[PDB]
mmCIF file of N, CA and C and ligand atoms in Angstrom:
data_model
loop_
_atom_site.group_PDB
_atom_site.id
_atom_site.type_symbol
_atom_site.label_atom_id
_atom_site.label_comp_id
_atom_site.label_asym_id
_atom_site.label_seq_id
_atom_site.Cartn_x
_atom_site.Cartn_y
_atom_site.Cartn_z
ATOM 1 N N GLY N 1 67.398 -31.904 39.437
ATOM 2 C CA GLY N 1 67.752 -33.227 39.330
ATOM 3 C C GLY N 1 69.325 -33.852 39.780
ATOM 4 N N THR N 2 70.067 -34.341 38.940
ATOM 5 C CA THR N 2 71.590 -34.439 39.437
ATOM 6 C C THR N 2 72.027 -33.294 39.208
ATOM 7 N N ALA N 3 73.418 -33.067 39.997
ATOM 8 C CA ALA N 3 74.556 -32.002 40.075
ATOM 9 C C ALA N 3 75.098 -31.826 38.686
ATOM 10 N N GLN N 4 75.200 -32.961 37.506
ATOM 11 C CA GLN N 4 75.266 -32.743 36.729
ATOM 12 C C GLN N 4 74.061 -32.077 35.534
ATOM 13 N N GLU N 5 73.113 -32.410 35.767
ATOM 14 C CA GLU N 5 71.752 -31.868 35.022
ATOM 15 C C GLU N 5 72.113 -30.337 35.291
ATOM 16 N N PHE N 6 72.130 -30.338 36.988
ATOM 17 C CA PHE N 6 72.101 -28.725 37.573
ATOM 18 C C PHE N 6 73.252 -27.771 36.339
ATOM 19 N N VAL N 7 74.194 -28.246 36.330
ATOM 20 C CA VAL N 7 75.524 -27.491 36.082
ATOM 21 C C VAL N 7 75.239 -27.001 34.611
ATOM 22 N N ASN N 8 74.827 -28.295 33.652
ATOM 23 C CA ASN N 8 75.195 -28.524 32.310
ATOM 24 C C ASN N 8 73.830 -27.906 32.045
ATOM 25 N N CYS N 9 72.714 -27.790 32.664
ATOM 26 C CA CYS N 9 71.534 -27.138 31.876
ATOM 27 C C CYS N 9 72.152 -25.350 31.949
ATOM 28 N N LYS N 10 72.953 -24.740 32.889
ATOM 29 C CA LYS N 10 73.095 -23.343 32.973
ATOM 30 C C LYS N 10 74.148 -23.194 32.065
ATOM 31 N N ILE N 11 75.402 -23.637 31.524
ATOM 32 C CA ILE N 11 76.139 -23.419 30.635
ATOM 33 C C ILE N 11 75.721 -23.325 29.461
ATOM 34 N N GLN N 12 76.049 -22.327 28.702
ATOM 35 C CA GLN N 12 75.463 -22.395 27.276
ATOM 36 C C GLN N 12 76.284 -21.220 26.551
ATOM 37 N N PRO N 13 76.569 -21.596 25.462
ATOM 38 C CA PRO N 13 76.961 -20.459 24.198
ATOM 39 C C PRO N 13 76.919 -19.498 24.440
ATOM 40 N N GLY N 14 77.281 -18.030 24.503
ATOM 41 C CA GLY N 14 77.018 -17.098 24.477
ATOM 42 C C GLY N 14 76.474 -16.167 25.687
ATOM 43 N N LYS N 15 76.471 -17.177 27.036
ATOM 44 C CA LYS N 15 76.167 -16.574 28.317
ATOM 45 C C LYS N 15 77.192 -16.542 29.380
ATOM 46 N N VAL N 16 76.981 -15.799 30.055
ATOM 47 C CA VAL N 16 78.039 -15.561 31.380
ATOM 48 C C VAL N 16 77.548 -16.442 32.359
ATOM 49 N N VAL N 17 78.217 -17.413 33.164
ATOM 50 C CA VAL N 17 77.553 -18.241 34.395
ATOM 51 C C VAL N 17 78.167 -17.917 35.297
ATOM 52 N N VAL N 18 78.283 -17.773 36.618
ATOM 53 C CA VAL N 18 78.833 -18.111 37.192
ATOM 54 C C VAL N 18 78.447 -18.773 38.342
ATOM 55 N N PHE N 19 79.444 -19.642 38.866
ATOM 56 C CA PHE N 19 78.589 -20.042 40.339
ATOM 57 C C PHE N 19 79.171 -20.086 41.280
ATOM 58 N N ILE N 20 78.223 -19.589 42.181
ATOM 59 C CA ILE N 20 78.269 -18.430 43.244
ATOM 60 C C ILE N 20 77.820 -19.696 44.882
ATOM 61 N N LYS N 21 78.840 -19.293 45.945
ATOM 62 C CA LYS N 21 77.458 -19.819 46.912
ATOM 63 C C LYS N 21 77.424 -18.769 48.170
ATOM 64 N N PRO N 22 76.314 -18.439 49.178
ATOM 65 C CA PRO N 22 76.665 -17.423 50.025
ATOM 66 C C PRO N 22 77.866 -17.190 50.835
ATOM 67 N N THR N 23 77.986 -16.044 51.337
ATOM 68 C CA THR N 23 79.115 -15.926 52.580
ATOM 69 C C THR N 23 80.797 -16.418 51.916
ATOM 70 N N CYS N 24 80.719 -15.823 50.483
ATOM 71 C CA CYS N 24 82.001 -15.907 49.644
ATOM 72 C C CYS N 24 82.584 -14.736 49.062
ATOM 73 N N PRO N 25 83.274 -13.793 49.834
ATOM 74 C CA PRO N 25 83.849 -12.889 49.323
ATOM 75 C C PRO N 25 84.405 -12.677 47.791
ATOM 76 N N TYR N 26 85.140 -13.505 47.751
ATOM 77 C CA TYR N 26 85.528 -14.056 45.930
ATOM 78 C C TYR N 26 84.390 -14.064 44.984
ATOM 79 N N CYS N 27 83.050 -14.018 45.386
ATOM 80 C CA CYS N 27 82.234 -14.564 45.042
ATOM 81 C C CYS N 27 81.652 -12.886 44.255
ATOM 82 N N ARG N 28 81.332 -12.322 45.246
ATOM 83 C CA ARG N 28 80.794 -11.311 45.260
ATOM 84 C C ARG N 28 81.476 -10.181 44.454
ATOM 85 N N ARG N 29 82.909 -10.649 44.387
ATOM 86 C CA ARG N 29 83.946 -9.451 43.430
ATOM 87 C C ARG N 29 83.190 -10.217 42.071
ATOM 88 N N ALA N 30 83.519 -11.078 42.119
ATOM 89 C CA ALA N 30 83.382 -11.830 40.666
ATOM 90 C C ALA N 30 81.913 -11.459 40.170
ATOM 91 N N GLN N 31 80.529 -10.932 40.823
ATOM 92 C CA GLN N 31 79.525 -10.615 40.617
ATOM 93 C C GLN N 31 80.307 -9.073 39.974
ATOM 94 N N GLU N 32 80.403 -8.430 40.914
ATOM 95 C CA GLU N 32 80.421 -6.797 41.059
ATOM 96 C C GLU N 32 81.665 -6.438 39.656
ATOM 97 N N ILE N 33 82.568 -7.744 38.933
ATOM 98 C CA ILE N 33 83.156 -7.143 38.110
ATOM 99 C C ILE N 33 82.022 -7.324 37.116
ATOM 100 N N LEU N 34 81.374 -8.124 37.390
ATOM 101 C CA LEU N 34 80.568 -8.790 35.775
ATOM 102 C C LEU N 34 79.636 -8.151 35.543
ATOM 103 N N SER N 35 78.774 -7.174 36.789
ATOM 104 C CA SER N 35 77.819 -6.849 37.108
ATOM 105 C C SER N 35 77.899 -5.274 36.284
ATOM 106 N N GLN N 36 79.344 -4.859 36.336
ATOM 107 C CA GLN N 36 79.888 -3.078 35.889
ATOM 108 C C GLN N 36 79.472 -3.363 34.601
ATOM 109 N N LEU N 37 79.546 -4.178 33.387
ATOM 110 C CA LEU N 37 79.334 -4.537 31.894
ATOM 111 C C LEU N 37 78.311 -4.169 31.088
ATOM 112 N N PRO N 38 78.167 -3.700 30.274
ATOM 113 C CA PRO N 38 77.017 -3.359 29.841
ATOM 114 C C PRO N 38 76.758 -4.928 29.063
ATOM 115 N N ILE N 39 76.967 -6.807 29.597
ATOM 116 C CA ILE N 39 76.294 -7.664 29.505
ATOM 117 C C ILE N 39 74.643 -7.457 29.109
ATOM 118 N N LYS N 40 74.070 -8.106 28.441
ATOM 119 C CA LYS N 40 72.511 -8.218 27.606
ATOM 120 C C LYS N 40 72.365 -8.741 28.569
ATOM 121 N N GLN N 41 70.733 -7.954 29.189
ATOM 122 C CA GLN N 41 70.254 -8.885 30.339
ATOM 123 C C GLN N 41 69.364 -10.267 30.010
ATOM 124 N N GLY N 42 69.822 -11.296 30.648
ATOM 125 C CA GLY N 42 69.523 -12.590 30.615
ATOM 126 C C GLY N 42 70.737 -13.424 30.212
ATOM 127 N N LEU N 43 71.998 -12.608 29.470
ATOM 128 C CA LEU N 43 73.550 -13.494 29.280
ATOM 129 C C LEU N 43 73.912 -13.719 30.343
ATOM 130 N N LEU N 44 73.884 -12.862 31.383
ATOM 131 C CA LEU N 44 74.510 -13.130 32.984
ATOM 132 C C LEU N 44 73.480 -13.319 34.012
ATOM 133 N N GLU N 45 74.190 -14.487 34.468
ATOM 134 C CA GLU N 45 73.601 -15.633 35.513
ATOM 135 C C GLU N 45 74.361 -15.781 36.301
ATOM 136 N N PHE N 46 74.118 -15.440 37.797
ATOM 137 C CA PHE N 46 74.614 -16.134 38.866
ATOM 138 C C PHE N 46 73.649 -17.205 39.662
ATOM 139 N N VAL N 47 74.363 -18.203 39.709
ATOM 140 C CA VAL N 47 74.012 -19.664 39.706
ATOM 141 C C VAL N 47 74.474 -20.049 41.629
ATOM 142 N N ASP N 48 73.500 -19.972 42.868
ATOM 143 C CA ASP N 48 73.574 -20.220 43.811
ATOM 144 C C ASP N 48 73.823 -21.667 44.382
ATOM 145 N N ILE N 49 75.012 -22.593 44.394
ATOM 146 C CA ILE N 49 74.826 -23.998 44.179
ATOM 147 C C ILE N 49 74.519 -24.563 45.583
ATOM 148 N N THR N 50 73.784 -23.726 46.280
ATOM 149 C CA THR N 50 73.213 -24.077 47.875
ATOM 150 C C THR N 50 72.047 -24.202 47.938
ATOM 151 N N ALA N 51 71.431 -23.927 46.598
ATOM 152 C CA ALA N 51 69.764 -23.367 46.645
ATOM 153 C C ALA N 51 68.919 -24.938 47.046
ATOM 154 N N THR N 52 69.415 -26.196 46.750
ATOM 155 C CA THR N 52 68.892 -26.930 46.330
ATOM 156 C C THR N 52 69.303 -28.127 47.602
ATOM 157 N N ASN N 53 70.496 -27.296 48.392
ATOM 158 C CA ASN N 53 71.195 -28.420 49.718
ATOM 159 C C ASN N 53 71.625 -29.876 48.627
ATOM 160 N N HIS N 54 72.213 -29.410 47.607
ATOM 161 C CA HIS N 54 73.306 -30.334 46.730
ATOM 162 C C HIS N 54 74.379 -29.735 46.853
ATOM 163 N N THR N 55 74.872 -29.219 47.798
ATOM 164 C CA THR N 55 76.175 -28.270 47.373
ATOM 165 C C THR N 55 77.886 -28.827 46.899
ATOM 166 N N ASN N 56 77.653 -30.102 47.860
ATOM 167 C CA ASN N 56 79.159 -31.371 47.911
ATOM 168 C C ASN N 56 78.807 -31.495 46.583
ATOM 169 N N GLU N 57 77.572 -32.374 45.953
ATOM 170 C CA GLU N 57 77.410 -32.826 44.713
ATOM 171 C C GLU N 57 77.582 -31.845 43.541
ATOM 172 N N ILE N 58 77.239 -30.872 43.329
ATOM 173 C CA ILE N 58 77.048 -29.635 42.476
ATOM 174 C C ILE N 58 79.138 -29.573 42.213
ATOM 175 N N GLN N 59 79.322 -29.257 43.524
ATOM 176 C CA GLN N 59 81.364 -28.542 43.867
ATOM 177 C C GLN N 59 81.925 -30.082 43.357
ATOM 178 N N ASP N 60 81.462 -30.708 43.747
ATOM 179 C CA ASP N 60 82.488 -32.319 42.703
ATOM 180 C C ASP N 60 82.273 -32.576 41.635
ATOM 181 N N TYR N 61 80.747 -31.772 40.598
ATOM 182 C CA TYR N 61 80.840 -32.274 39.533
ATOM 183 C C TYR N 61 81.653 -30.952 38.662
ATOM 184 N N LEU N 62 81.381 -29.592 39.355
ATOM 185 C CA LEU N 62 82.497 -28.443 38.693
ATOM 186 C C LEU N 62 83.995 -29.012 39.028
ATOM 187 N N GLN N 63 84.242 -29.781 39.721
ATOM 188 C CA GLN N 63 85.765 -30.176 39.526
ATOM 189 C C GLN N 63 85.763 -31.160 38.651
ATOM 190 N N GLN N 64 85.245 -32.536 38.474
ATOM 191 C CA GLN N 64 85.246 -33.563 37.210
ATOM 192 C C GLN N 64 85.191 -32.424 35.720
ATOM 193 N N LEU N 65 84.326 -31.499 35.919
ATOM 194 C CA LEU N 65 84.277 -30.575 34.768
ATOM 195 C C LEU N 65 85.235 -29.490 33.987
ATOM 196 N N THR N 66 85.282 -29.157 35.879
ATOM 197 C CA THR N 66 87.047 -28.125 35.294
ATOM 198 C C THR N 66 88.411 -27.782 35.855
ATOM 199 N N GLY N 67 88.282 -28.957 36.910
ATOM 200 C CA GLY N 67 89.358 -29.140 37.400
ATOM 201 C C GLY N 67 89.781 -28.782 38.975
ATOM 202 N N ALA N 68 88.889 -27.716 39.099
ATOM 203 C CA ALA N 68 88.651 -27.195 40.318
ATOM 204 C C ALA N 68 87.110 -27.106 40.872
ATOM 205 N N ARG N 69 86.841 -27.228 42.461
ATOM 206 C CA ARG N 69 85.848 -27.607 43.058
ATOM 207 C C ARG N 69 85.219 -26.158 43.703
ATOM 208 N N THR N 70 86.193 -24.846 43.445
ATOM 209 C CA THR N 70 85.794 -24.109 44.449
ATOM 210 C C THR N 70 84.836 -23.108 43.577
ATOM 211 N N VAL N 71 84.109 -22.424 44.275
ATOM 212 C CA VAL N 71 83.339 -21.100 43.539
ATOM 213 C C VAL N 71 83.820 -19.781 44.217
ATOM 214 N N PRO N 72 84.132 -18.815 43.423
ATOM 215 C CA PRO N 72 83.449 -18.473 42.300
ATOM 216 C C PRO N 72 83.722 -19.684 40.793
ATOM 217 N N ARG N 73 82.921 -20.024 40.164
ATOM 218 C CA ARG N 73 83.432 -21.085 39.002
ATOM 219 C C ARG N 73 82.932 -20.139 37.826
ATOM 220 N N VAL N 74 83.807 -19.322 37.143
ATOM 221 C CA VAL N 74 82.879 -18.684 36.337
ATOM 222 C C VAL N 74 83.362 -19.321 34.672
ATOM 223 N N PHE N 75 81.979 -18.782 33.709
ATOM 224 C CA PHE N 75 81.946 -19.776 32.641
ATOM 225 C C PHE N 75 81.483 -18.600 31.781
ATOM 226 N N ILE N 76 82.443 -18.188 30.909
ATOM 227 C CA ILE N 76 82.002 -17.247 29.215
ATOM 228 C C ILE N 76 81.568 -18.682 28.192
ATOM 229 N N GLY N 77 80.295 -18.428 28.283
ATOM 230 C CA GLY N 77 80.410 -19.636 27.477
ATOM 231 C C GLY N 77 80.466 -20.986 27.775
ATOM 232 N N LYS N 78 81.051 -21.897 27.054
ATOM 233 C CA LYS N 78 81.560 -23.382 27.303
ATOM 234 C C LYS N 78 82.580 -23.293 27.951
ATOM 235 N N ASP N 79 83.367 -21.942 27.661
ATOM 236 C CA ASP N 79 84.671 -21.923 28.232
ATOM 237 C C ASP N 79 84.739 -21.532 30.145
ATOM 238 N N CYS N 80 85.496 -22.670 30.766
ATOM 239 C CA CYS N 80 85.443 -21.867 31.971
ATOM 240 C C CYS N 80 86.806 -21.206 32.288
ATOM 241 N N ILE N 81 86.519 -20.422 32.764
ATOM 242 C CA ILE N 81 87.970 -18.773 33.123
ATOM 243 C C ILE N 81 88.091 -19.361 34.191
ATOM 244 N N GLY N 82 87.482 -19.618 35.235
ATOM 245 C CA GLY N 82 88.122 -20.457 36.490
ATOM 246 C C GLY N 82 87.628 -19.554 37.361
ATOM 247 N N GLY N 83 88.296 -19.354 38.145
ATOM 248 C CA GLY N 83 88.141 -18.415 39.358
ATOM 249 C C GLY N 83 88.266 -17.232 39.480
ATOM 250 N N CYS N 84 87.920 -16.414 40.600
ATOM 251 C CA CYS N 84 88.155 -14.977 40.483
ATOM 252 C C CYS N 84 89.169 -14.083 40.302
ATOM 253 N N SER N 85 90.866 -14.709 40.296
ATOM 254 C CA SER N 85 91.707 -14.488 40.293
ATOM 255 C C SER N 85 91.799 -14.478 38.200
ATOM 256 N N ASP N 86 91.452 -15.463 38.324
ATOM 257 C CA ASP N 86 91.346 -15.313 36.549
ATOM 258 C C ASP N 86 90.354 -13.958 35.927
ATOM 259 N N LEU N 87 89.860 -14.065 36.255
ATOM 260 C CA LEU N 87 88.513 -13.169 35.854
ATOM 261 C C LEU N 87 89.046 -11.804 35.735
ATOM 262 N N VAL N 88 89.672 -11.576 36.995
ATOM 263 C CA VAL N 88 90.604 -10.128 36.997
ATOM 264 C C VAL N 88 91.678 -9.996 36.102
ATOM 265 N N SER N 89 91.998 -11.068 36.444
ATOM 266 C CA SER N 89 93.858 -11.043 34.831
ATOM 267 C C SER N 89 92.681 -10.421 33.378
ATOM 268 N N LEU N 90 91.843 -11.414 33.211
ATOM 269 C CA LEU N 90 91.231 -10.795 32.119
ATOM 270 C C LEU N 90 90.531 -9.933 32.041
ATOM 271 N N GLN N 91 89.937 -9.150 33.122
ATOM 272 C CA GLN N 91 89.507 -8.161 33.119
ATOM 273 C C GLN N 91 90.380 -6.916 32.906
ATOM 274 N N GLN N 92 91.501 -7.062 33.578
ATOM 275 C CA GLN N 92 92.668 -6.062 33.339
ATOM 276 C C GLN N 92 93.157 -5.838 32.331
ATOM 277 N N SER N 93 93.206 -6.899 31.615
ATOM 278 C CA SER N 93 94.139 -7.101 30.415
ATOM 279 C C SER N 93 93.224 -6.714 29.033
ATOM 280 N N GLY N 94 91.865 -6.144 29.061
ATOM 281 C CA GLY N 94 90.821 -6.200 28.092
ATOM 282 C C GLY N 94 90.254 -7.294 27.545
ATOM 283 N N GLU N 95 90.877 -8.905 27.894
ATOM 284 C CA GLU N 95 90.550 -10.251 27.277
ATOM 285 C C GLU N 95 89.229 -10.318 27.511
ATOM 286 N N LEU N 96 88.887 -9.839 28.744
ATOM 287 C CA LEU N 96 87.470 -10.191 29.483
ATOM 288 C C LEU N 96 86.198 -9.451 28.135
ATOM 289 N N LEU N 97 86.302 -7.998 27.625
ATOM 290 C CA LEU N 97 85.832 -7.548 27.175
ATOM 291 C C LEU N 97 85.959 -7.787 25.759
ATOM 292 N N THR N 98 87.034 -8.026 25.376
ATOM 293 C CA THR N 98 87.580 -8.523 23.758
ATOM 294 C C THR N 98 86.409 -9.852 23.373
ATOM 295 N N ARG N 99 86.610 -11.053 24.948
ATOM 296 C CA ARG N 99 85.663 -11.976 24.431
ATOM 297 C C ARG N 99 84.018 -11.836 24.312
ATOM 298 N N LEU N 100 83.561 -11.147 25.189
ATOM 299 C CA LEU N 100 82.159 -10.666 25.511
ATOM 300 C C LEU N 100 81.766 -10.239 24.034
ATOM 301 N N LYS N 101 82.687 -9.333 23.213
ATOM 302 C CA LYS N 101 82.213 -8.959 22.239
ATOM 303 C C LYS N 101 82.138 -9.853 21.054
ATOM 304 N N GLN N 102 83.106 -10.675 21.180
ATOM 305 C CA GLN N 102 82.978 -11.814 19.858
ATOM 306 C C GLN N 102 81.679 -12.772 20.453
ATOM 307 N N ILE N 103 81.471 -12.933 21.390
ATOM 308 C CA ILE N 103 80.636 -14.468 21.566
ATOM 309 C C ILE N 103 79.127 -13.698 21.377
ATOM 310 N N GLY N 104 79.298 -12.114 21.573
ATOM 311 C CA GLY N 104 77.765 -11.226 21.466
ATOM 312 C C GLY N 104 77.062 -11.166 22.000
ATOM 313 N N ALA N 105 77.564 -10.888 23.353
ATOM 314 C CA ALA N 105 76.953 -11.324 25.041
ATOM 315 C C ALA N 105 76.736 -9.303 25.592
ATOM 316 N N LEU N 106 76.903 -8.457 24.525
ATOM 317 C CA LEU N 106 77.345 -7.558 25.142
ATOM 318 C C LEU N 106 75.353 -6.663 24.618
ATOM 319 N N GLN N 107 75.003 -5.347 25.569
ATOM 320 C CA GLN N 107 73.334 -4.948 25.305
ATOM 321 C C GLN N 107 73.157 -4.542 23.831
HETATM 322 S S1 LIG W 201 68.685 -28.634 31.082
HETATM 323 C C1 LIG W 201 67.363 -27.033 31.545
HETATM 324 C C2 LIG W 201 66.231 -27.764 32.562
HETATM 325 S S2 LIG W 201 64.882 -26.274 32.681
HETATM 326 O O1 LIG W 201 65.531 -25.414 33.200
HETATM 327 O O2 LIG W 201 64.237 -25.905 31.474
HETATM 328 O O3 LIG W 201 64.344 -26.961 33.740
HETATM 329 S S1 LIG W 202 89.152 -11.734 42.531
HETATM 330 C C1 LIG W 202 90.516 -12.799 43.599
HETATM 331 C C2 LIG W 202 90.841 -11.820 44.585
HETATM 332 S S2 LIG W 202 92.153 -11.418 44.159
HETATM 333 O O1 LIG W 202 93.368 -12.879 44.141
HETATM 334 O O2 LIG W 202 92.081 -11.030 42.522
HETATM 335 O O3 LIG W 202 93.241 -10.389 44.643
#
């Protein structure tokens, strides 16, 4: 369906969702950071925004929803973390782990 549906359907409280595209070094780094962690299977999802041939529309909606159109676009539940640098900052400070504990996402 619509870009809004594609995105909103995926974002869920308690779940880590990262919108990505192919050929995206920062997407791969975001994936590495999050895949290291003991997040429960099913509560981490990487979403290829190009797979339905509506890349631009999806980025347009991400821009509307979050203020930026770029991937990776990282969500912890409904919270938009932002991009890769944002995620790195949280990982390093320990805030990523604390947030995952609070929302019950660990295995
Ligand atoms: S909003 C979720 C739609 S679906 O994935 O069940 O098809
Ligand atoms: S994670 C994106 C690369 S960097 O800004 O953290 O150097």
